[PDB]
Scaffold this active site. Sequence first.
Site, PDB file in Angstrom:
ATOM      1  N   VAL A  66      11.247  17.309  -3.861  1.00  0.00           N
ATOM      2  CA  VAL A  66       9.841  16.487  -4.116  1.00  0.00           C
ATOM      3  C   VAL A  66       9.976  14.824  -3.697  1.00  0.00           C
ATOM      4  CG1 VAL A  66       8.395  15.496  -5.827  1.00  0.00           C
ATOM      5  CG2 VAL A  66       9.524  17.901  -6.036  1.00  0.00           C
ATOM      6  N   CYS A  67       9.004  14.517  -2.836  1.00  0.00           N
ATOM      7  CA  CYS A  67       9.199  13.155  -2.218  1.00  0.00           C
ATOM      8  C   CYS A  67       8.324  12.196  -3.179  1.00  0.00           C
ATOM      9  CB  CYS A  67       8.891  13.135  -0.839  1.00  0.00           C
ATOM     10  SG  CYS A  67       8.841  11.380  -0.269  1.00  0.00           S
ATOM     11  N   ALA A  68       8.634  11.398  -3.941  1.00  0.00           N
ATOM     12  CA  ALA A  68       8.199  10.467  -4.594  1.00  0.00           C
ATOM     13  C   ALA A  68       7.863   9.194  -3.733  1.00  0.00           C
ATOM     14  CB  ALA A  68       8.856   9.758  -5.805  1.00  0.00           C
ATOM     15  N   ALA A  69       6.400   8.986  -3.724  1.00  0.00           N
ATOM     16  CA  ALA A  69       5.952   7.845  -2.986  1.00  0.00           C
ATOM     17  C   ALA A  69       6.750   6.396  -3.273  1.00  0.00           C
ATOM     18  CB  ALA A  69       4.398   7.652  -2.947  1.00  0.00           C
TER      19      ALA A  69
ATOM     20  N   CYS B  18      13.564  11.140   1.951  1.00  0.00           N
ATOM     21  CA  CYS B  18      12.144  10.622   2.114  1.00  0.00           C
ATOM     22  C   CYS B  18      12.009   9.352   2.082  1.00  0.00           C
ATOM     23  CB  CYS B  18      11.078  11.529   1.829  1.00  0.00           C
ATOM     24  SG  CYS B  18      10.863  11.078   0.063  1.00  0.00           S
TER      25      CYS B  18
END
Lengths: 164, 164
Positions: free
Chosen positions: B59-62, B94
């Site tokens: 999961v890529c957290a902004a 990311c």
Amino acid sequence: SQTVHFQGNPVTVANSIPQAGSKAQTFTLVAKDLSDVTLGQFAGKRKVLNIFPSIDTGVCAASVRKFNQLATEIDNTVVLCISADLPFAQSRFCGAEGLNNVITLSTFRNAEFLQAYGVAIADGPLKGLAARAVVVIDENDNVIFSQLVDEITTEPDYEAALAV
Amino acid sequence: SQTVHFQGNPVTVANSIPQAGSKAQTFTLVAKDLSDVTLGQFAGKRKVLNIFPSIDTGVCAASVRKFNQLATEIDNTVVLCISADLPFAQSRFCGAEGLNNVITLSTFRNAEFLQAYGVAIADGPLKGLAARAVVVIDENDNVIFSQLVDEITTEPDYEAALAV
């Protein structure tokens, strides 16, 4: 105490890998759900320890899948693909797709496993990682076969996967 | 020892995180190419240690990227995203890629760093991983800011990315 190779350079591997006829040493490793797992949790089953420097290469070699597929075909067997990758990364392993009795275990917080089983890379750029090896343990936690692959990037013989 | 939380459950973290005003202890970590890296190699710069339990969760957290972007806004900054993930998995981060002066370092063979900087999770399933934390070290190698995040699943204060 043991020496393998990688990138054309020799690599040192601590101690010695288990020998046939020996009683398997217990160990604790981590599963994909972060819980702990010991050898005794597989009592009464045949155990095939598939040890890798890493199972997160991003490549799905047919040879690797074949080995796991062969290992699981023997009766009452469980294949443990072990490495230092974190459980998080081990999910990307594509060498055991659809094989219900293949489990990924991490050594990230159990370095003593590598020492006890003689697969701990002791130097070079891969220090801290596990060497490529296979250890087969029977229903009575006895070791019936073991193999430390001379060349780290190479796979063990298929024969190992079928040990009894 | 200190206490924080994982999904609301109490979690103990070894020793104490460096406090503002203290002197930053040297450390050795492993870069993407598997080479060793020390704090001294960043001498003369503002170092923002962005420590995670893992930067390879799928999961890529902004929020992650923005925090890193903001940190690079402060003069002469280098952001070190540190975790127990192996150099192989940290590549998929990311929150880094796309930004200059944001590098990932692994503690896979330097677990003592987690102990020295007081971010080593001591119990529960996340045992062996780093707590979520930020430590900002200035040009004189003095710690000028640090935060050991209360809930390991949440992200740090953005003021952390801008601390001096």
